[PDB]
Structures are given as structure tokens and as C-alpha cells.
Coordinates of C-alpha atoms in Angstrom, one line a residue:
Chain D
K233 CA -32.0 3.4 -3.3
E234 CA -29.7 2.7 -6.4
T235 CA -27.0 5.4 -7.0
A236 CA -26.7 7.0 -10.4
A237 CA -23.1 5.4 -10.3
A238 CA -24.5 2.1 -9.8
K239 CA -27.3 2.3 -12.3
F240 CA -24.7 3.5 -14.7
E241 CA -22.8 -0.1 -14.2
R242 CA -26.3 -1.8 -14.6
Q243 CA -27.3 0.0 -17.8
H244 CA -23.7 0.0 -19.5
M245 CA -21.3 -2.3 -17.9
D246 CA -20.5 -5.8 -19.0
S247 CA -16.7 -6.3 -18.8
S248 CA -17.0 -10.1 -20.4
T249 CA -15.9 -10.3 -24.1
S250 CA -18.7 -10.4 -26.4
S251 CA -26.9 -10.7 -32.9
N252 CA -29.3 -11.2 -30.0
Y253 CA -27.2 -9.9 -27.3
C254 CA -29.1 -6.7 -27.1
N255 CA -32.5 -8.1 -26.9
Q256 CA -31.3 -10.5 -24.2
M257 CA -29.4 -8.0 -22.2
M258 CA -31.9 -5.0 -22.3
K259 CA -34.5 -7.4 -21.0
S260 CA -32.4 -9.0 -18.3
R261 CA -30.5 -5.9 -17.1
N262 CA -34.4 -4.7 -16.5
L263 CA -33.8 -1.7 -18.5
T264 CA -37.2 -2.0 -20.6
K265 CA -39.4 -1.6 -17.3
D266 CA -40.9 1.8 -18.1
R267 CA -40.4 2.4 -21.7
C268 CA -38.3 1.3 -24.4
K269 CA -34.7 3.0 -24.2
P270 CA -34.2 3.9 -28.0
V271 CA -30.5 3.2 -27.7
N272 CA -28.3 1.8 -25.0
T273 CA -24.7 1.0 -25.3
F274 CA -22.8 -1.9 -23.4
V275 CA -19.2 -1.5 -22.6
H276 CA -16.7 -4.6 -22.6
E277 CA -13.9 -3.1 -20.6
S278 CA -13.1 -3.3 -16.9
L279 CA -15.0 -0.9 -14.5
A280 CA -11.7 0.6 -13.7
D281 CA -10.8 1.5 -17.4
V282 CA -14.4 3.0 -17.9
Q283 CA -14.0 4.9 -14.8
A284 CA -10.8 6.3 -15.9
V285 CA -12.7 8.0 -18.8
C286 CA -13.4 10.7 -16.2
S287 CA -9.9 11.9 -16.2
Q288 CA -9.3 11.5 -20.2
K289 CA -10.4 13.9 -22.8
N290 CA -12.9 16.5 -21.5
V291 CA -15.6 17.1 -24.2
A292 CA -19.1 18.3 -24.6
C293 CA -22.1 16.0 -24.2
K294 CA -24.5 16.3 -27.1
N295 CA -26.9 18.4 -25.1
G296 CA -24.1 21.0 -24.6
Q297 CA -23.3 20.2 -20.9
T298 CA -19.4 20.1 -20.5
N299 CA -18.6 17.5 -17.7
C300 CA -18.5 14.8 -20.3
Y301 CA -15.5 12.8 -21.3
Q302 CA -14.2 10.8 -24.4
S303 CA -12.1 7.8 -23.7
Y304 CA -8.6 8.5 -25.2
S305 CA -8.7 4.9 -26.8
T306 CA -11.7 3.3 -28.5
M307 CA -13.3 0.6 -26.5
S308 CA -15.0 -2.8 -27.4
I309 CA -18.7 -1.9 -27.3
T310 CA -22.1 -3.3 -28.2
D311 CA -24.4 -0.7 -29.5
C312 CA -28.2 -1.5 -28.9
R313 CA -30.9 0.5 -31.1
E314 CA -34.5 -0.3 -31.5
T315 CA -35.4 -1.9 -34.9
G316 CA -38.4 -3.4 -36.6
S317 CA -41.6 -3.4 -34.7
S318 CA -40.3 -2.4 -31.1
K319 CA -43.1 -1.3 -29.2
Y320 CA -43.4 -1.1 -25.2
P321 CA -43.9 -3.5 -23.5
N322 CA -42.5 -5.6 -26.3
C323 CA -39.2 -3.7 -27.0
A324 CA -37.0 -4.9 -29.8
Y325 CA -33.2 -4.3 -30.5
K326 CA -30.8 -4.5 -33.3
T327 CA -27.2 -5.3 -32.1
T328 CA -24.0 -4.1 -33.4
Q329 CA -20.3 -4.9 -32.0
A330 CA -18.0 -2.1 -32.4
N331 CA -14.8 -0.3 -31.3
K332 CA -15.5 3.2 -30.7
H333 CA -14.6 5.9 -28.2
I334 CA -17.2 6.2 -25.4
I335 CA -18.4 9.6 -24.2
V336 CA -19.8 9.7 -20.4
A337 CA -20.8 12.3 -18.1
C338 CA -19.2 12.2 -14.8
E339 CA -20.1 13.6 -11.3
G340 CA -19.0 13.3 -7.7
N341 CA -15.9 12.7 -5.9
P342 CA -14.8 10.1 -6.5
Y343 CA -15.8 11.1 -9.7
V344 CA -17.4 8.4 -11.9
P345 CA -19.6 7.9 -14.9
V346 CA -23.3 8.8 -14.2
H347 CA -24.5 8.8 -18.0
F348 CA -23.4 7.3 -21.2
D349 CA -23.8 9.8 -23.9
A350 CA -22.7 8.4 -27.2
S351 CA -20.1 6.2 -28.8
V352 CA -17.8 7.9 -31.6
Chain A
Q128 CA 1.9 18.7 -13.4
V129 CA -1.7 17.3 -14.5
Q130 CA -3.3 18.4 -11.2
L131 CA -4.8 21.9 -10.6
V132 CA -2.7 24.0 -8.2
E133 CA -3.9 27.2 -6.7
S134 CA -2.1 30.1 -5.4
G135 CA -2.7 33.6 -3.8
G136 CA -5.2 34.0 -1.0
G137 CA -4.8 34.4 2.9
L138 CA -5.6 37.3 5.0
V139 CA -7.0 40.6 3.5
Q140 CA -9.3 43.5 4.6
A141 CA -12.5 45.2 3.4
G142 CA -10.2 45.2 -0.3
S143 CA -8.3 43.1 -3.1
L144 CA -7.1 39.7 -3.6
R145 CA -6.2 37.7 -6.9
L146 CA -6.3 33.8 -6.9
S147 CA -4.7 31.8 -9.8
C148 CA -4.9 28.3 -10.6
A149 CA -3.0 26.3 -13.2
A150 CA -3.2 22.4 -14.4
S151 CA -0.7 22.9 -17.0
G152 CA 0.2 19.4 -17.6
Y153 CA -3.4 18.3 -18.4
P154 CA -2.7 18.0 -22.1
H155 CA -6.3 19.2 -23.6
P156 CA -8.5 22.2 -22.8
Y157 CA -10.7 22.1 -19.8
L158 CA -14.0 23.3 -21.2
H159 CA -15.2 24.7 -17.9
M160 CA -12.9 26.1 -15.3
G161 CA -14.0 28.0 -12.0
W162 CA -14.0 28.9 -8.6
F163 CA -16.1 27.4 -5.6
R164 CA -16.0 28.4 -2.0
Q165 CA -17.1 27.0 1.1
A166 CA -17.6 29.9 3.7
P167 CA -17.8 29.1 7.3
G168 CA -21.3 28.0 8.2
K169 CA -22.5 27.2 4.6
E170 CA -22.6 24.5 1.6
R171 CA -20.1 24.6 -1.0
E172 CA -21.2 27.1 -3.7
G173 CA -20.0 28.0 -7.2
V174 CA -18.7 31.3 -7.3
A175 CA -17.6 32.0 -11.0
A176 CA -17.0 29.7 -14.0
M177 CA -15.8 30.2 -17.5
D178 CA -15.9 28.2 -20.9
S179 CA -12.9 27.7 -22.9
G180 CA -14.4 28.7 -26.4
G181 CA -17.0 31.5 -25.8
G182 CA -19.7 29.3 -24.3
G183 CA -20.2 31.3 -21.3
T184 CA -19.1 33.0 -18.0
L185 CA -21.1 32.7 -15.0
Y186 CA -21.1 34.3 -11.6
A187 CA -23.1 33.7 -8.5
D188 CA -25.6 36.3 -7.6
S189 CA -23.7 37.3 -4.3
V190 CA -20.6 38.1 -6.2
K191 CA -21.8 40.0 -9.4
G192 CA -20.2 43.1 -9.9
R193 CA -17.3 42.4 -7.3
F194 CA -15.4 39.5 -8.5
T195 CA -14.4 38.9 -12.2
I196 CA -13.0 35.5 -13.6
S197 CA -10.6 35.2 -16.3
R198 CA -8.7 32.5 -18.2
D199 CA -5.7 32.2 -20.3
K200 CA -6.0 31.3 -23.8
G201 CA -5.4 27.8 -24.6
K202 CA -3.6 26.8 -21.3
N203 CA -5.8 25.7 -18.2
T204 CA -5.2 28.7 -16.2
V205 CA -8.0 30.5 -14.5
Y206 CA -8.0 33.7 -12.2
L207 CA -10.4 35.2 -9.6
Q208 CA -9.9 39.0 -9.2
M209 CA -11.9 39.7 -5.9
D210 CA -12.7 43.3 -5.2
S211 CA -15.1 45.0 -2.9
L212 CA -14.7 42.4 -0.2
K213 CA -17.1 41.6 2.5
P214 CA -16.6 39.7 5.6
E215 CA -19.0 37.1 4.3
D216 CA -16.6 36.2 1.5
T217 CA -14.5 34.7 4.3
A218 CA -14.2 31.0 3.0
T219 CA -12.2 28.2 1.7
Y220 CA -11.7 28.9 -2.0
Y221 CA -11.3 26.0 -4.5
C222 CA -10.3 26.0 -8.2
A223 CA -12.2 23.4 -10.3
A224 CA -12.0 22.3 -13.9
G225 CA -13.9 19.9 -16.3
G226 CA -17.4 20.3 -14.9
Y227 CA -20.3 22.5 -15.8
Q228 CA -21.3 26.1 -14.8
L229 CA -21.5 26.3 -11.0
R230 CA -22.6 22.6 -10.5
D231 CA -20.4 21.3 -7.7
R232 CA -21.1 17.7 -8.5
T233 CA -20.2 18.0 -12.3
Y234 CA -16.5 18.9 -11.3
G235 CA -14.3 16.2 -10.2
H236 CA -11.0 17.8 -10.8
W237 CA -10.0 20.2 -8.0
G238 CA -7.1 22.4 -6.7
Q239 CA -5.8 22.0 -3.0
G240 CA -8.1 24.6 -1.7
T241 CA -7.0 28.3 -0.6
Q242 CA -8.1 30.1 2.7
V243 CA -9.3 33.5 2.2
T244 CA -10.1 35.3 5.7
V245 CA -11.5 39.1 5.4
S246 CA -11.4 41.1 8.3
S247 CA -13.4 44.2 9.2

């Protein structure tokens, strides 16, 4: 049974330095199995630097939960958004490379990211 | 410094104690801070938590009317005033910060634990 922390790595982590990326990664990381996710962000940093965010700036998630954290620094990311004619099971993404703060919700001890909220 | 440090606690009778906890070196507000306990024989449970900006205060049903939580304004310090104490309040108490409401798994930043043993 995949843990939430491991799913976060599968959905959100690609430490390698980076217009088709999103289309290719959403398919290949097996993220479009059940429905098209409307947005999904990949983070191009070490896993450690991402897990570190859980001890950086405590913020509210968009939904109002308060166990979210914003990276003190911006991070290299790819933002993937549904575009054009995307329709399950044929999902379609627009790719945008950026440098933005990430906001994650953290759970557990060890306290690690379990949900990617937004990039700002 | 950055880590939470608890004080107070120990032996008490059916009766009063005041626990305190500070993370003075964490240099932003922790949105939620609160207290959890693990009573002998029982899963850890949240006892009280309070938001930094008016977003809410919460008590476990079993302590309503007996315990009162408070926080310093804009310093990461949280207090638990414990009155009307019962033997079943015996427990290791823990300060927590940076999580949401009374959800143990959402808190990853903890004090060191404080034993409270309530006698007849």
C-alpha cells in the first residue's frame, strides 16, 4: 500500500533539472488513471530540500487547514494545467517552467509533505 | 531556541496546574499551537488548540469547562490552565505547534513531554 508520503514523491518530485514535459510526466507517473487532475506541480529540487519545507514558514493551505508550509526560498518547478481539449481518459496539459515558493501540507513524524497545495 | 520547550507539570491532587511551552526562536507565528496528552492505557489525544489570529479555539469534549488554553500575542508561547483535575487526567502532556486543530498527525513540531500524575 503506497504511503501518502510516497505518493507525494510520485506525484510531485522530479529532482532533475528541467513544452511537452507535463503531458509526458502526467501520463508516465500514472497520475491520470482515474480522472484528469486539473493542475499538478513538479518540483526540481532534492527530496531533502522539499521535506525541509515542513520546518519553514507555517501558512494556511487554501482550504483553511493550518498544517501547510511555504518554502522560505522559491524553488525550480514545472506547473502543469489542463489546456485545450483535455478530456478523460485523454488528458492534456500546458507546461510552464517557473521559480516559485511551494506550499505543502505536512503530516507524521518524521514530518514530511503529504499534499502539494500551490506554488506562489 | 527554535524547538518547543515545556515547563510546569508533575504531581498534583484532585486541583490546579499551569503548563507552559515556548518556541521563541521560531521566527514566524505558528498558526495553531496546542496541547495533546497520552494517558496511561490510551492513544494520544488532542486536549486544546488555539489559532494565532482569531481562527478558532478548540477543546476536547473530556476537558471542556476544566482546562483553558491561552497564547501570548505574536510570540510562540502556549499555556494550559488545568483545573477541576480528575485521576483520569493523569498522562504525559505534550506541547505542539504548526498543525491543525486537534489532529495529532498534522503536528510535527513538539515539546519534550511533561508528566502529570493526579492523585486521589
